[PDB]
CSV table of C-alpha atoms and ligand atoms in Angstrom, one decimal:
chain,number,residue,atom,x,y,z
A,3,UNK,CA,-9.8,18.1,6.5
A,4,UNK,CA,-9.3,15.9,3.8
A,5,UNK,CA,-11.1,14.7,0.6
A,6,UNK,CA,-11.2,10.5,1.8
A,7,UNK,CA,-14.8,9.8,2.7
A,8,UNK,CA,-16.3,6.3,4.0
A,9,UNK,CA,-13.8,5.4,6.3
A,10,UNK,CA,-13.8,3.9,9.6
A,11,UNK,CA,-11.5,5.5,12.4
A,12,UNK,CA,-9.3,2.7,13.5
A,13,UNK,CA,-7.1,4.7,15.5
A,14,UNK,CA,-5.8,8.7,15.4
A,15,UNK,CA,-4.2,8.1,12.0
A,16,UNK,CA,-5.1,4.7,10.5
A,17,UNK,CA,-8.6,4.7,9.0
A,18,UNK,CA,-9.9,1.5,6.5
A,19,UNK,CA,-12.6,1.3,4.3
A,20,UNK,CA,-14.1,-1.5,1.9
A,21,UNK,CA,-12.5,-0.6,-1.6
A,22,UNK,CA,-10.8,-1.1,-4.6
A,23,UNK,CA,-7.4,1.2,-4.3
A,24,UNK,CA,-7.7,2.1,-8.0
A,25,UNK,CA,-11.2,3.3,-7.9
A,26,UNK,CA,-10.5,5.0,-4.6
A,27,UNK,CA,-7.3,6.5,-6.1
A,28,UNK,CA,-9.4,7.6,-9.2
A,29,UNK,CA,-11.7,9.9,-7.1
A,30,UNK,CA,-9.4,11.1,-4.6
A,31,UNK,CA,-6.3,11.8,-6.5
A,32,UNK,CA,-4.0,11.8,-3.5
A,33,UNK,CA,-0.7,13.0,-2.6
A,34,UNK,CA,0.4,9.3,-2.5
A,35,UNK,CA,-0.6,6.1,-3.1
A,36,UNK,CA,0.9,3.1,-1.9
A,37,UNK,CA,2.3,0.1,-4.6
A,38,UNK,CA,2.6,-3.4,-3.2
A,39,UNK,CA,5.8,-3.5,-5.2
A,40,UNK,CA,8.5,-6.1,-5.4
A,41,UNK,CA,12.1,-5.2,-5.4
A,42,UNK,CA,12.3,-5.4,-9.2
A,43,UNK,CA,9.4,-3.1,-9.6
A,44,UNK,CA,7.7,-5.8,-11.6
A,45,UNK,CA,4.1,-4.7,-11.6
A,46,UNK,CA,2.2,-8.2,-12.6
A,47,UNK,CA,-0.4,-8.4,-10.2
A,48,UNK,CA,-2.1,-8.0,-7.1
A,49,UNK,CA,-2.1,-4.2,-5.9
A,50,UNK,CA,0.9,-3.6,-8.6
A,51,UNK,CA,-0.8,-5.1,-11.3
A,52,UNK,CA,-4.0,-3.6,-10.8
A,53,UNK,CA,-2.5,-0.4,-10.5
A,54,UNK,CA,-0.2,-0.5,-13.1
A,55,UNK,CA,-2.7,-1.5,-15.7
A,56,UNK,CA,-4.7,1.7,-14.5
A,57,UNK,CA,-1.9,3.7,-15.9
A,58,UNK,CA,-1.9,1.9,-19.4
A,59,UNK,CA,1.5,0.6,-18.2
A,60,UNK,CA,2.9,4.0,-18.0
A,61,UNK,CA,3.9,3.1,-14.2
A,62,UNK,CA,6.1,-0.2,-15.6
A,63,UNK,CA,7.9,1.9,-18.2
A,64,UNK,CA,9.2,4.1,-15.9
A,65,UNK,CA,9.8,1.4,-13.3
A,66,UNK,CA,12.0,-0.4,-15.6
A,67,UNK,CA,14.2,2.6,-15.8
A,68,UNK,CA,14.3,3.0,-12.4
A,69,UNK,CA,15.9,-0.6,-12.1
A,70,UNK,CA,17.7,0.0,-15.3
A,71,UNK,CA,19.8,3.3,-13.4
A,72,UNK,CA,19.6,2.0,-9.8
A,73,UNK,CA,19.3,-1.8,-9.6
A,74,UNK,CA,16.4,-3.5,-7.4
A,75,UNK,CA,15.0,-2.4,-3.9
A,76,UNK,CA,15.7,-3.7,-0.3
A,77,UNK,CA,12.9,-5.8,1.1
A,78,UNK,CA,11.7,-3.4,3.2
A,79,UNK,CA,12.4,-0.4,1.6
A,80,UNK,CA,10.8,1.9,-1.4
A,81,UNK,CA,10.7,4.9,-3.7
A,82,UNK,CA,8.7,7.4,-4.7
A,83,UNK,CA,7.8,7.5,-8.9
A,84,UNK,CA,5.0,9.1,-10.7
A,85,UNK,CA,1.2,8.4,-9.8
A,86,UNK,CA,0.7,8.9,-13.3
A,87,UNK,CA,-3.4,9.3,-13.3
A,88,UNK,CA,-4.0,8.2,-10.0
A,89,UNK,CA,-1.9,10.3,-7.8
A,90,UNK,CA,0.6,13.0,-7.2
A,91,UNK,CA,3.2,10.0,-6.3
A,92,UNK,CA,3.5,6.3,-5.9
A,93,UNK,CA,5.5,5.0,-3.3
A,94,UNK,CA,6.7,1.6,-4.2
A,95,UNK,CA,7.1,0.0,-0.7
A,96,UNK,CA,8.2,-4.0,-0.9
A,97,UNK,CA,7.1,-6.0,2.0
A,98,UNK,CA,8.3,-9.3,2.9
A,99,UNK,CA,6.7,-12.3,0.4
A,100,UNK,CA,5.9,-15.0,2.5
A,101,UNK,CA,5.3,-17.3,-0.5
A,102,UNK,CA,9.5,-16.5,-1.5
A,103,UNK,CA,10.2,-17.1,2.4
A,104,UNK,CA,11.2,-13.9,3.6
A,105,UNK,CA,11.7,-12.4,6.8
A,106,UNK,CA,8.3,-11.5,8.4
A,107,UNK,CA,10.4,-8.8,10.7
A,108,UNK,CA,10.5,-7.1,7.7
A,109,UNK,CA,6.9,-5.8,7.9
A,110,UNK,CA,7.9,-3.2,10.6
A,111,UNK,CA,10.9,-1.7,8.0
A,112,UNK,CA,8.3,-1.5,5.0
A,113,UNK,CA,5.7,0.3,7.2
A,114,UNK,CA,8.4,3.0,8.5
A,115,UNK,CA,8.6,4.5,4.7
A,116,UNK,CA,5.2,5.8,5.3
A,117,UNK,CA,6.0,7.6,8.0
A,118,UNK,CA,7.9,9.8,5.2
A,119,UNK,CA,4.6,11.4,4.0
A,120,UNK,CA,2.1,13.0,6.0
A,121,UNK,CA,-1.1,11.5,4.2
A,122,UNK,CA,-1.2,7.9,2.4
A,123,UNK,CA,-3.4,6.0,0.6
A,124,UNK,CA,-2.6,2.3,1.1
A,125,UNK,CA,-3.0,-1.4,0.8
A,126,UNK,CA,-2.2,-3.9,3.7
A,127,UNK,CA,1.6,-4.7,2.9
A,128,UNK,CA,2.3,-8.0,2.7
A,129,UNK,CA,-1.0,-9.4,2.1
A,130,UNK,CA,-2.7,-11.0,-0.9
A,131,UNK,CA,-0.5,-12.7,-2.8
A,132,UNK,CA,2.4,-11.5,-1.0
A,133,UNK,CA,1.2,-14.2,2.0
A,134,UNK,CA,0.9,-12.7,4.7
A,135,UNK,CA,-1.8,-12.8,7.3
A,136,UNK,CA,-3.7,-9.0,7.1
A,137,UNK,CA,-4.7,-9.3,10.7
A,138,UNK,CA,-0.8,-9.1,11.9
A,139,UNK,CA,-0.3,-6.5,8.8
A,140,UNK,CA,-3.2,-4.7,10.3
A,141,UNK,CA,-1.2,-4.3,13.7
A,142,UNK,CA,2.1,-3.6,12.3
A,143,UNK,CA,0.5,-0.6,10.7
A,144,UNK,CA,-1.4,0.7,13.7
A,145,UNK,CA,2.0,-0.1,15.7
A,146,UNK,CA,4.6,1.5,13.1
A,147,UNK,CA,3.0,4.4,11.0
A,148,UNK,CA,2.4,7.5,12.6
A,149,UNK,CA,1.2,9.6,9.8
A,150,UNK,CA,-2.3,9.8,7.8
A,151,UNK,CA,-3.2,6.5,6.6
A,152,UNK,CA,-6.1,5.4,4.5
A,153,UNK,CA,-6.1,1.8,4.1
A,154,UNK,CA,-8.2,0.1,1.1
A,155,UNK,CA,-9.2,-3.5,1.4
A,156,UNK,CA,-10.2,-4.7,-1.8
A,157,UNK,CA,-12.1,-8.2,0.0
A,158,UNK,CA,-15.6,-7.2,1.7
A,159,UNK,CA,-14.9,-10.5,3.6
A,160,UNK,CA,-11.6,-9.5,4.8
A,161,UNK,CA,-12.2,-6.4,5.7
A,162,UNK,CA,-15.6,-7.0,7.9
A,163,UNK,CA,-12.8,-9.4,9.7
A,164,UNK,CA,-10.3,-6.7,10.1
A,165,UNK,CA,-12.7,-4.8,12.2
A,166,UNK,CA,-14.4,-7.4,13.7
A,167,UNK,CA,-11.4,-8.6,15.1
A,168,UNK,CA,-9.5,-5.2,15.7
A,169,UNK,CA,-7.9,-4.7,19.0
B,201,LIG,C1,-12.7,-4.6,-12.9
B,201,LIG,N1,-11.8,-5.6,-13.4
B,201,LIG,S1,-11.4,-6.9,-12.4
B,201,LIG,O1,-10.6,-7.9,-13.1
B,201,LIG,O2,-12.5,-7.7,-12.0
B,201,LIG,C2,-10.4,-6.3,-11.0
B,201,LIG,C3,-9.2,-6.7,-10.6
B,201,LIG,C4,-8.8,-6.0,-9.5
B,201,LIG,C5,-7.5,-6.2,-8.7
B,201,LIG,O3,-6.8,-7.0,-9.1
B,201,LIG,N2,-7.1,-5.4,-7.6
B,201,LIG,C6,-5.8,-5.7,-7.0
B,201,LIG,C7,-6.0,-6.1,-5.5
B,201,LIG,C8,-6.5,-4.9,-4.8
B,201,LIG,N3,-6.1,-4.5,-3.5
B,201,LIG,C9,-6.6,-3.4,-3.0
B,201,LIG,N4,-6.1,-3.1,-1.6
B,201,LIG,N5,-7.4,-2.6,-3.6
B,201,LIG,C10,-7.8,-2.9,-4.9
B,201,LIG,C11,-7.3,-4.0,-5.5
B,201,LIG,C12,-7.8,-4.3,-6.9
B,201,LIG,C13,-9.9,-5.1,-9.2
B,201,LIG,O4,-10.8,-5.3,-10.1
């Protein structure tokens, strides 16, 4: 038993629900939470700037010294840095940015970090203003992660077409 509430059961493990991620990170206060990041950690907007400005910028500070010691990310990949006051951890995970034209094979790669942590709260990888459609990002995630996953999907709109349209 676990403390996320509202959700719809999509499949064993991957649940969605109507909501902003920093509210719903706010009242949880889960293990993890999942950044939309790009490999430069720079938090600007979307997911990452949302939830960077929810940490007073405390989560670009220390991503700058991240970069600073370890240079940029893989598409693909991630780490895990401070959830500051919204979670135990973030994990940074970068999907592929459509609108900077790369590979949409990548999707697969970035959902395999979550199956590093048995519980996740998450955005759709990929999506927003990272370009890509949230229906595929939708089936990459039922088709890749095998652990806990709570997905938040800021749109109302979007997400009554996730479900609608869920296989
Ligand atoms: C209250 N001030 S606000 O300017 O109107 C406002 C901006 C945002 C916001 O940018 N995001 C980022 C996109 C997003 N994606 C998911 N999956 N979840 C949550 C969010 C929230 C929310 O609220």
């Amino acid at each position: 038993v676990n403390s996320f509430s509202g959700y719809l059961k999509l499949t064993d493990n991957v649940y969605i629900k109507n909501a902003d991620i920093v509210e719903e990170a706010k009242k949880v206060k889960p293990t993890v939470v999942v950044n939309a990041a790009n490999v430069y950690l720079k938090h600007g907007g979307g997911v990452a700037g949302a939830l960077n400005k929810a940490t007073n910028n405390a989560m670009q500070v220390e991503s700058d010294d991240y970069i600073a010691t370890n240079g940029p990310l893989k598409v693909g990949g991630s780490c895990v840095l401070s959830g500051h006051n919204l979670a135990k951890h973030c994990l940074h995970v970068v999907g592929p940015n459509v609108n900077k034209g790369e590979d949409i094979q990548l999707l697969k790669s970035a959902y395999e970090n979550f199956n590093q942590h048995e519980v996740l709260l998450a955005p759709l990888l990929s999506a927003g203003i990272f370009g890509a459609d949230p229906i595929h990002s939708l089936r990459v995630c039922v088709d890749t992660v095998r652990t806990n996953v709570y997905l938040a999907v800021f749109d109302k709109n979007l997400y009554d077409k996730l479900v609608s349209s869920f296989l």
